[PDB]
Design an enzyme around this catalytic site. Structure first.
Site, PDB file in Angstrom:
ATOM      1  N   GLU A  11     115.506  29.354  -2.174  1.00  0.00           N
ATOM      2  CA  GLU A  11     116.121  30.674  -2.266  1.00  0.00           C
ATOM      3  C   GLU A  11     115.467  31.678  -3.210  1.00  0.00           C
ATOM      4  OE1 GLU A  11     118.988  30.256   0.599  1.00  0.00           O
ATOM      5  OE2 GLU A  11     118.154  31.908  -0.508  1.00  0.00           O
ATOM      6  N   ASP A  20     117.918  40.284   1.815  1.00  0.00           N
ATOM      7  CA  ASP A  20     117.471  38.967   2.206  1.00  0.00           C
ATOM      8  C   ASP A  20     116.571  39.077   3.484  1.00  0.00           C
ATOM      9  OD1 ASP A  20     120.464  37.322   3.733  1.00  0.00           O
ATOM     10  OD2 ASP A  20     119.269  38.948   4.457  1.00  0.00           O
ATOM     11  N   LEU A  32     124.854  35.891  -1.032  1.00  0.00           N
ATOM     12  CA  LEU A  32     124.982  37.014  -0.143  1.00  0.00           C
ATOM     13  C   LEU A  32     126.023  37.966  -0.629  1.00  0.00           C
ATOM     14  CD1 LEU A  32     124.573  38.544   2.548  1.00  0.00           C
ATOM     15  CD2 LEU A  32     126.503  37.312   3.286  1.00  0.00           C
ATOM     16  N   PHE A 104     124.654  25.929   3.028  1.00  0.00           N
ATOM     17  CA  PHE A 104     124.510  27.015   2.048  1.00  0.00           C
ATOM     18  C   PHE A 104     123.888  28.288   2.670  1.00  0.00           C
ATOM     19  CE2 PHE A 104     124.019  28.216  -2.515  1.00  0.00           C
ATOM     20  CZ  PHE A 104     123.091  29.256  -2.417  1.00  0.00           C
ATOM     21  N   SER A 117     122.197  18.142  17.401  1.00  0.00           N
ATOM     22  CA  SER A 117     121.448  17.609  16.283  1.00  0.00           C
ATOM     23  C   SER A 117     122.329  16.738  15.478  1.00  0.00           C
ATOM     24  CB  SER A 117     121.090  18.710  15.356  1.00  0.00           C
ATOM     25  OG  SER A 117     120.281  19.600  16.055  1.00  0.00           O
ATOM     26  N   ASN A 132     115.193  18.380  17.895  1.00  0.00           N
ATOM     27  CA  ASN A 132     116.248  19.286  18.354  1.00  0.00           C
ATOM     28  C   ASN A 132     116.491  20.427  17.329  1.00  0.00           C
ATOM     29  OD1 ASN A 132     119.543  19.803  18.562  1.00  0.00           O
ATOM     30  ND2 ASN A 132     118.458  19.460  20.463  1.00  0.00           N
TER      31      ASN A 132
END
Ligand code: CL
Ligand code: CL
EC number: 3.2.1.17
Length: 162
Positions: A11, A20, A32, A104, A117, A132
């Protein structure tokens, strides 16, 4: 290496409001702030979160406080989610950190739509799940970050991160 260090790498750390990869106002360690286009709305959301008039800037300490809360929210969000929980409980420690990274970055919600998945992960079909996982917008948009997480699931090691 752990979850904190892992996300901290994926991040980055910024102390000033920023856009972002999707152009949403963010700050700190991937926190965010808002989906909206108003920087004002961002500033207002920041101040409400931090509990003071930040003027769009926070210290390291405060970034780190948001980061703690966000990791904690994520874990508890998986644990409370009926589709994720079982997934998470079946995995080993490294891989859980990978599922926490995804949650996250994208919300319990975005994560729970990788059913296929997920189910492969539950069966321990590592290579298949990795293939996948790669057929997703998620990977096409942020391919390098997606590859690290993906290796992580695939191998159950931290190699992508060293
Ligand atoms: Cl908050
Ligand atoms: Cl990326």
């Amino acid at each position: 290496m752990n979850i904190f260090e892992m996300l901290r790498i994926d991040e980055g750390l910024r102390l000033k409001i920023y856009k972002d990869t999707e152009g949403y106002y963010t700050i700190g360690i991937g926190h965010l702030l808002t989906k909206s286009p108003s920087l004002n709305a961002a500033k207002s959301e920041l101040d409400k979160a931090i509990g003071r008039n930040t003027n769009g800037v926070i210290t390291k300490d405060e970034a780190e406080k948001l980061f703690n809360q966000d990791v904690d929210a994520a874990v508890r969000g998986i644990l409370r989610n009926a589709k994720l929980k079982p997934v998470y409980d079946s995995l080993d420690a490294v891989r859980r950190a990978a599922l926490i990274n995804m949650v996250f970055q994208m919300g319990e919600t975005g994560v729970a739509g990788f059913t296929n998945s997920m189910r492969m992960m539950q069966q321990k079909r590592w290579d298949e799940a990795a293939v996948n996982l790669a057929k997703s917008r998620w990977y096409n948009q942020t391919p390098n970050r997606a590859k690290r997480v993906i290796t992580t699931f695939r191998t159950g090691t931290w190699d992508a991160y060293k």
